[PDB]
Amino acid sequence: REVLTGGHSVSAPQENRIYVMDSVFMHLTESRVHVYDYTNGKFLGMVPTAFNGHVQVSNDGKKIYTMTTYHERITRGKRSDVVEVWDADKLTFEKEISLPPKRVQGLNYDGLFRQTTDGKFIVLQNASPATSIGIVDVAKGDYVEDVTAAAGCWSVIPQPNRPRSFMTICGDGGLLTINLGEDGKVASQSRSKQMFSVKDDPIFIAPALDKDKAHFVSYYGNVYSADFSGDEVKVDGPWSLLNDEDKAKNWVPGGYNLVGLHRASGRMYVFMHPDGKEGTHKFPAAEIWVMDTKTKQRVARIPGRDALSMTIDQQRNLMLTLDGGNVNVYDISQPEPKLLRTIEGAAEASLQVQFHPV
Amino acid sequence: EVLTGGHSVSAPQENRIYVMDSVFMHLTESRVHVYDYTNGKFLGMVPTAFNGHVQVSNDGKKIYTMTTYHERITRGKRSDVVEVWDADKLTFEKEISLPPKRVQGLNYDGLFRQTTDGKFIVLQNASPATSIGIVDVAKGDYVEDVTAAAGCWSVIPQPNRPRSFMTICGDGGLLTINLGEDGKVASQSRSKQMFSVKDDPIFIAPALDKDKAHFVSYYGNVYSADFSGDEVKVDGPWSLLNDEDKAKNWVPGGYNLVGLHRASGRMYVFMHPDGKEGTHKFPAAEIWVMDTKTKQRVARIPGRDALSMTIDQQRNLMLTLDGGNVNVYDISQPEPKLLRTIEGAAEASLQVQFHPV
Amino acid sequence: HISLNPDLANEDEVNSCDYWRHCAVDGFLCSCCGGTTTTCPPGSTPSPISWIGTCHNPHDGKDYLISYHDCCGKTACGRCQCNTQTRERPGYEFFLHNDVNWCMANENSTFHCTTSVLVGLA
Amino acid sequence: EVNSCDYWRHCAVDGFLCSCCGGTTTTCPPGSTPSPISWIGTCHNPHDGKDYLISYHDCCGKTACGRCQCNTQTRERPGYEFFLHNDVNWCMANENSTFHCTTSVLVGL
Ligand SMILES: NCc1ccc([N+](=O)[O-])cc1
Ligand SMILES: NCc1ccc([N+](=O)[O-])cc1
Ligand SMILES: NCc1ccc([N+](=O)[O-])cc1
Ligand SMILES: NCc1ccc([N+](=O)[O-])cc1
Secondary structure (H helix, E strand, O other), X not given: OOXXXXXXXXXXXXXXXXXXXXXXXXXXXXXXXEEEEOOOOEEEEEEEOOEEEEEEEOOOOOEEEEXXXXXXXXXXXXXXXXXXXXXXXXXXXXXXXEEOOOEOOEOOOHHHXXXXXOOOEEEEEEEOOOEXXXXXXOOOOEEEEEEHXXXXXXXXXXXXXXXXXXXXXXOOOOEXXXXXXXXXXXXXXXXXXXXXXXXXXXXXXXXXXXXXXXXXXEOXXXXXXXXXXXXXXXXEEEEEOXXXXXXXXXXXXXXXXXXXXXXXXXXXXXXXXXXXXXXXXXXXXXXXXXXXXXXXXXXXXXXXXOOOEEEEEOOOXXXXXXXOOOEEEEEOOOOOOEEEEEEOOOOOOEEEEEEXXX | OOOEOOOOOOOOHHHEEXXXXXXXXXXXXXXXXXXXXXXXXXXXXXXXXXXXXXEEOOOOOEEEEEEEEEOOOOOOOEEEEEEEEEXXXXXXXXXXXXXXXXXXXXOOHHHEEEOOOOOEEEEEEXXXXXXXXXXXXXXXXXXXXXXXXXXXXXXXXXXOOOOEEEEEEOOOOEEEEEEXXXXXEEEEEEOOOOOOOOOOOEOOOOEEOOOEEEEEEOOOEEEEEEOOOOOXXXXXXXXXXXXXXXXXXXXXXXOOOEEEEOOOOEEEEEEEOOOOOOOOOOOOOEEEEEEOOOOEEEEEEEOOOOOEEEEEOOOOEEEEEOOOOEEEXXXXXXXXXXXXXXXXXXXXXXXXXXXXX | OHHHOHHHOOHHHHOOOOOHHHOOOEEEEHHHOOOEOOEOOOOOEEEEEEEEEEEEOOOOOOEEEEEEEEEEOOOOOOOOEEEOOXXXXXXXXXXXXXXXXXXXXXXXXXXXXXXXXXXXXX | OOOOOOOXXXXXXXXXXXXXXXXXXXXXXXXXXXXXOOEEEEEEEOXXXXXXXXXXXXXEOOOOOOOOEEEOOOXXXXXXXXXXXXXXXXXXXXXXXXXXXXXXEEEEO
């Protein structure tokens, strides 16, 4: 009477889709990406990502990129670090791209697995434990460059105003900028002046990223900025997130992917909690503060729902927040965000959610 | 202080039990958790990839696992293997290649066994056509495929013979296989029909004596196979149920749901009331203790939602397992006495086993 | 007749373990995994083999043969885990048995989710 | 005790305590391999009022122990201070990088 068929595509349009990167830390060799419709909470599909997978969606919205590690016998045997290319609509494996066996194994901060603005290179973090940035040429489907200049630095911040440039945060408290050539090799680089004191005011690595500048928050609730409108990065800060009334309760930021920028308004979103002290930098959000980055002032504050990570959609004026297991959807078209819905049980242990590009 | 490895399990072998955690929600990361039953201490573990099975060598020196790998887990070439692990160091020693048809399924004891003499591992295959695989431990080789066992299921070794075992067949009888010194089938026999497959299906889990095995049915009857002699003699049914039991619709339920204390002939069974079609895998409302000679129940105690069990003969102990927690019972007297519960021994285990002593 | 077409039913009804055609399902319902009662989630492969159940349809009073084909080659879906055992039998009645992985003959035997396909009247 | 996440030496552990996994504070469970590298923490010993360097060498080559998961972040810093950072796998350089559990080894003041 009926026959089971496969070969099917994701049921909901790309504009509805979000990607929840589930580390499944209790069984980290079976990490995976869960694909959800953010409009109604519907589970749409998944992509298996083996041990500590990382994920992103191609800029063109056609492909899902994953990064993972295999061994011949999982807990023994030869290692293979790879980038995989999967079809976005069919959620099927297409290609493996070999990496040297030193891709970063760690929690899913955005900046460990990124791409150039032009979508032509995948840019990832290595640690052997010496740090370098690896470059994958999408057209070739090959690894093409180890950016050893980035030794002593961490994470990848693409520059949205340049086709194949990105920045990274270094142990001197400045930023190193890398400009790739069309072959994916380093064409030029520069190093900013010192932005922040590593010892006295360490920043969270998560950028609040605009077209031509990036803002960063610190352990103590200060904000630093990096302007890349020009060839050399100019740095500035601190200004404090806190007003006088905030200081009494020791408000400080906390989380993982803990900030976001709504570019059209200049509004920066930041997870915060009171009673800050040494060791509270990864605490869940008591509140989400909304800062006007031009005036350097808070314009809104709402309850945080114990969120740890966020992402923003510019076009639809949305913010997602994630507490490890549940995803909250907010309308951020006005300064005060409005909670639309919560997707319960989207993951067991996810610190990263991303929109499908539209 | 310097961190070191190379260490052996801290507790004596006689204290050790093996909880086979399927981790069904993440079945590619199944593992064996090793515990000390005397104090509930976690002693270590062996990773077993996708749907691992486990046993301990008869001599207590090695752990055998059976599992499936693929080059890229969800794609790439398949490798079905047996692995040999040191029991004290919990380290991998040797891989034995299998044909890619080892049974993928829940951890009934009878899917992964060994001969009494310890020389051969005997495992269940399904391609979906069933056969029994023989692995020569010393040679580290798969040596015989028992296709004569097609249409049968599970391995019941005969403790009174060095390299013989039985399997339950779709005709309601038992097929006995006797191996030669090289692991090839030397001889085989089929019993007469023990049970009606359609009218009174049995659970596969044997309550195994030295020279006979008892089985319980979906409807609370008991069947036996005696292999003291040259051919298997079969008997039954007798009912576990008295009139009051019947009126409340008590039936057995679980997975590895029975056990036998050989010295006393007491048989242990997980039971639940309000039995009907579809309740054969329900958790135990009670454990019933039957005297297999008088065919009378001698005890009934709370079941603690248990699903599987195992018995240690020498120490007069029963373990029960609800999927996550292990209960330790003293069974030296007809009424069992609960000694302790080990909470969170697994996420999804249907099998626990003692280290051989 | 409407009770024979799960695509017309409310999704909460068909995604429940008590839905009449799920009577021998032991696994995650594909309909909760980005698939439907009779279609695999994207990028998972149907099993060419299965166990079979007979389930009573309480809506039309007839009994039906249901084939429990799995979808394979992806890791465990994890949603709508069901365990129903109506008329299920042990491994010596192998195609009535659900404690085995019916992805066993697939190119990749990783178990993703389980479907309930209507074969016809029992 | 040492199995408590609040035990003073565990002040920058984000993982499973090996002492709950068949090992000890300073020994890997059987068949898990020590990492030759680690992040380091600075923890206050309340018993003597002195602060100590603690090395958080992992045990590797087995799947996640899953017991006594601790997450303390005292003096922990991001990846640009790499050996103070605990959001990466310190089994990353082992023959097999699968993460099993974390040890807390006293180095010195
Ligand atoms: N230090 C804990 C830890 C271990 C492994 C990962 N990882 O992603 O593989 C993250 C964090
Ligand atoms: N041990 C750090 C950590 C904290 C929160 C999550 N999570 O998924 O919410 C993962 C890992
Ligand atoms: N029918 C569900 C199911 C699937 C896979 C296994 N297994 O052991 O791999 C057992 C049971
Ligand atoms: N769906 C069948 C089943 C039931 C119980 C367990 N368990 O571990 O208790 C595992 C698998």
